[PDB]
Design a protein around this ligand. Structure first.
Ligand SMILES: [Ca+2]
Ligand SMILES: [Ca+2]
Ligand SMILES: [Zn+2]
Ligand SMILES: [Zn+2]
Lengths: 62, 62
């Protein structure tokens, strides 16, 4: 399928960043994963379009 | 040893909470773990004395 395949997640919990370049999100927000190595994934919000690093346990693939 | 044994952690990354009852902390802050089941652990900051739930990947046992 498309490039979104294995690369869409839903936030399980809200996240407020505390480090420049980290991305916040609301619970239930959908994000596109750009890079998924280590415990901080590069993502793009499908709500705001903004990009940055997210804590991987706060989201689930769907 | 003492009850602190297996129950002290150091924050690997800062955390800003976004849910009542969740506990924020600075990078390098030391916390006492009160409960360590699931991915949200009940903790007490050894900086502020405050208690609440923390995301377990943000800390490391020491
Ligand atoms: Ca998990
Ligand atoms: Ca970890
Ligand atoms: Zn960070
Ligand atoms: Zn919470």
């Amino acid at each position: 399928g498309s490039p979104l395949q294995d690369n869409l997640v839903i936030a399980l919990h809200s996240y407020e960043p505390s480090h420049d370049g980290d991305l916040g999100f609301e619970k239930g927000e959908q994000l596109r994963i750009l890079e998924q190595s280590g415990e901080w994934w590069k993502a793009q919000s499908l709500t705001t379009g903004q990009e940055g690093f997210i804590p991987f346990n706060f989201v689930a693939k769907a």
